[PDB]
Amino acid sequence: ESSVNPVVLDFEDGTVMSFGEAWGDSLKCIKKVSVSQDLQRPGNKYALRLDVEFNPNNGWDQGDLGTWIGGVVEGQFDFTGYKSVEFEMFIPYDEFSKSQGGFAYKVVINDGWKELGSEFNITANAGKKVKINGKDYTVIHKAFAIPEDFRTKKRAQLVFQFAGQNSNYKGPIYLDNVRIRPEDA
Ligand SMILES: [Ca+2]
């Protein structure tokens, strides 16, 4: 089987789907990675919970979270015919709204540290606000292109970098619906 089937890391098997440190001691601001039912709702039972603690004196309080597309560590994945990577992030709105500063993220195919996209200065007023299980969440949703030069066999590590920007936020950030897609961005 050589396909261009969508690769959908939605945590719906109730595992972390190979998410963890991108390299030794890389998690840093991310104090725990777990599979969580906190956002359990019709059609969507599990998400990846990242317990973070940012320091408000640190302008770039980074941590790096990786997964292996295919689960095989130091495996290659053939990105031929894949054109975008999509994801959603959820941050509890009331707690995040009380925090100072903001946070940034990068989405990277880590074969030569190739950034697909990034955003900075995320606060509770970014994206959209959605109520889940009694609680409002700030929701970030983006699709970034896989550039044509990377649509080939590459080291199969997808990395999410998170960085506190003079933030004092201490709480979960949830990741869900990470898709490596044949569709364009
Ligand atoms: Ca899910």
Domain with residue 112: its CATH number is 2.60.120.260
Annotated binding residues for Ca(2+): 10, 12, 44, 46, 176
Environment class of residue 158 by beta-carbon count within 10 Å: exposed (0-12), middle (13-18) or buried (19+)?
buried
User: Which domain range does residue 153 map to?
Assistant: 1-185
177 and 46 Cβ atoms separated by less than 8 Å = no
Cα 20 to ligand 1 centre (Å): 17
CA of 176 to the centre of ligand 1 (A): 5
HSE, side-chain direction, 13 A CA sphere, residue 95: 13
Q: For residue 107, give every residue at least 6 positions away whose Cβ sits within 8 Å of its Cβ, in sequence order, or none.
A: 85, 87, 115, 116, 117, 118, 142, 144, 158, 159, 160
Q: Are 136 and 93 in contact (CB under 8 A)?
A: yes
Distance (angstroms) between ligand 1 centre and the Cα of 87 equals 11
Domains in the chain: how many in total? 1
Position 29, amino acid: C
Query: Which amino acid is present at 117?
Result: G
CA 182 / ligand 1 centre spacing (Å): 20
